[PDB]
Amino acid sequence: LHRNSLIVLADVALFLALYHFLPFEHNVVLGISMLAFIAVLWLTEALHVTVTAILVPVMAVFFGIFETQAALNNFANSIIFLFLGGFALAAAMHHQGLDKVIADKVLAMAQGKMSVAVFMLFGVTALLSMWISNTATAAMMLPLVLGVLSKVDADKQRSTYVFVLLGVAYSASIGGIATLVGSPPNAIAAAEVGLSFTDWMKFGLPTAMMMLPMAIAILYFLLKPTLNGMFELDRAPVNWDKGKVVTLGIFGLTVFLWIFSSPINAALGGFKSFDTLVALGAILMLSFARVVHWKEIQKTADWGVLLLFGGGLCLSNVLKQTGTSVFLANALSDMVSHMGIFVVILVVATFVVFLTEFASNTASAALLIPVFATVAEAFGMSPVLLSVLIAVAASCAFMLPVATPPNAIVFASGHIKQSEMMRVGLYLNIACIGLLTAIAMLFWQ
Amino acid sequence: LHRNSLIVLADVALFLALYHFLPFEHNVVLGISMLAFIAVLWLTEALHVTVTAILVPVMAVFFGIFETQAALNNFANSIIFLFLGGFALAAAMHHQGLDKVIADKVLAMAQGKMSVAVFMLFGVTALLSMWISNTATAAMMLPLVLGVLSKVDADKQRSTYVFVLLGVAYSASIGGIATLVGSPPNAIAAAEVGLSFTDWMKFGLPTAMMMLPMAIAILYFLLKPTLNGMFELDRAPVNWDKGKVVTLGIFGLTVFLWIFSSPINAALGGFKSFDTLVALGAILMLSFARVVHWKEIQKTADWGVLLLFGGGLCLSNVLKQTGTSVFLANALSDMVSHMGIFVVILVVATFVVFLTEFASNTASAALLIPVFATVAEAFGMSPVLLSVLIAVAASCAFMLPVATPPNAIVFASGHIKQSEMMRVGLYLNIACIGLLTAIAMLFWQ
């Protein structure tokens, strides 16, 4: 007796209508009907996206596509455990106060001036969300801006809060674009096409360090904050201790292995998923050093996202087995030939941004990469390009906080203006699309 | 600089010593060394058992036994999602207050007399832990006994608390013996040998309904509580509401499918893991009815146990591939022939009970079933028998609460006597061993 339940029932009706009123082959029609069913559920949020991910194997099995174990085996792909290692590092830092220490040392780097402390905050948020996550990285940095701006006349000068708030909220999202960890869509792209950490970083890091300064510029030239005073916090300086240095060293070692995985993996025997093995080894070393415990890790890690990966992967395998992907590519050849690759990528990224406005970034990614990339497999036209393009565009979200939990946390202070944030996000969306397409045209050809 | 770290290093030393000072084949020596390594870690609790489970695939891969994905695929076995569905049902009941309602209706069944309310409490705990878990089932029932016994002179008459406390603590553990859900060891046994819900229930339910009355008798004839008065609670009677009835119907439907899975699965096409599919469908129906949400499920479900299943399964597959199991069975043939099956099962169950005293029940099970059952595979001598015997014995634990979280919760009231509980557990252990072996000799032959 709820709109969500009505959505599910109408969605079942659409599934049946497609099943019995489509003049295609049995496997392709089945896959298209499943894709529509799951698409509506993920976009409309009638059920939780994790629950829909759990539903994908069940309907896949009951239609005789996969065996139960084969369908469920996509919930233990190596990328899932890679993100698990990322969450473990996050738990270690939040448990040891290392993120607070990093912010305090940065803020000691800036003597007392706001005009650059915010910039170092954005940069630190990028470097930190690169390896961890977005929502976590926003939570601890919000109290900092409140303390810094507690003496700035918060009744007529609120754009300064808005700058030092949205810059962090978007810096985390852009920091997720440089490394596989930090943003679930990037993992999904790597999962479908097959990607190493270093190669994906060569594709992502330039985009991150070029997108982020642009976004900061957009805000600064749109809204005009002061950034001319001085701040003098009253809080005490936290200093180094055992555990903090050890987990810092483990973090550096893990990054070093993830970067030089190809030579190391070649020397050690050439294992298939050395990045994931490094993630698990990081968990083992943290447990060995007793810097964190599994209950912290269990409380911190979002297992719903890890199951949503399984949903996306099972959907991709379903579309691959059923032939829907090649059927779609063959039907879309005429459109992709008439319209150049330039306009093709413009419409794809534009559609992604308008899609995550009224949807979840990760759910939309898990819906989209299996379609276009498998389509791009048949086309030729390296699907790594489209996969990363969609994955990065998913992280670029600048809409009403219901779209994005980071925006929810940062909005929750309760003084930011709805319409102003919409217009700011509009300009940011436009700039991201243009810059992304320029990168793909010039660098990736 | 901790005893746990010293244990890990000495454990590495034992691994290397076995590697280079054992005159067996390379694969069998490798598997034995891994088994010793993991055994010590799980028993000594140097690291968390979940962390050790994560370690098993890493060392398996780095020694060239499995590919990374093949090793990790044991973390998504269908049994794991079966237990996930159990946790989802638990979340629904704790969210809707249904367990409180069940206890209140039972306590309305008993007008005001303690002499049978405790017995219905033990029985309800059995029927409830059959489908859910142990620790959860203990938590809500402890306040009940406090309220009932708040007027019983808790300075000289404490054995009444002890009866109404340990009976529940052990009723949950025994309730886990009748169904696959409720106790992780039973899932591990089903996983290795291959077992359906109904068949395992034919093996387990008689044992549960025969073990539980015996245990209650042991306590009643050892310690003498009064159970002759009347209680008059002051709390209000909670009544039925929407959601409670719906999740009750879903629980009944899920049980009905799990029982009549074989005919239904035969009719529907004969799917491989219809029990797991029923579990997932239960999650879907709960989400569809909006009686529970994924954040309740995520907070409730213990993902460490689900990963520990993957550790046990990967260890079993490692021992199977390496030939350690058949090597062990061939070396132990002379002992198993000289000593009859009767004495073999007596020593096995006796060793299990003395093992879980200073260890975790589930970790010990994940250590033991892969050894004996795969050994029993080669012997003949149906390994279902040994697997279930070890799995049920693991649930039978009556030792210091550090062994068992249910005992931790029930002890935490702080008036129970250490030595008395040890002696009570000793007699209970003895009776469980004897009765279990009688069942295996007579019924299972």
Numbering used by the authors:
A (entry chain B), B (entry chain A): 18 to 462
What does the paper say about this structure?
Substrate transport of VcINDY is driven by the inwardly-directed Na+ gradient, with dicarboxylate import coupled to the co-transport of three sodium ions. Here, using a combination of cryo-EM structure determination, succinate binding and site-directed cysteine alkylation assays, we demonstrate that the VcINDY protein couples sodium- and substrate-binding via a previously unseen cooperative mechanism by conformational selection.
VcINDY was therefore purified in the presence of 100 mM Ch+ as the only monovalent cation. Unlike the VcINDY map in 300 mM Na+ for which 3D classification converged to a single map, the VcINDY-choline dataset yielded four distinct classes at a resolution range of 3.6—4.4 Å resolution. The 3D class with the highest resolution was further refined to 3.23 Å resolution. While the VcINDY Ci-apo state overall structure is similar to those in the 300 mM Na+ (r.m.s.d of 0.672 Å), the model exhibited significant changes near the Na1 and N2 sites. Instead of converging to one structure, the simulated annealing resulted in an ensemble of structures, with the greatest variations occurring in the HPinb and TM10b regions. As the 3.23 Å apo map imposes C2 symmetry on one of four classes of particles in ChCl, and all four classes are different, the degree of flexibility of these helices in the Ci-apo state is likely to be even greater.
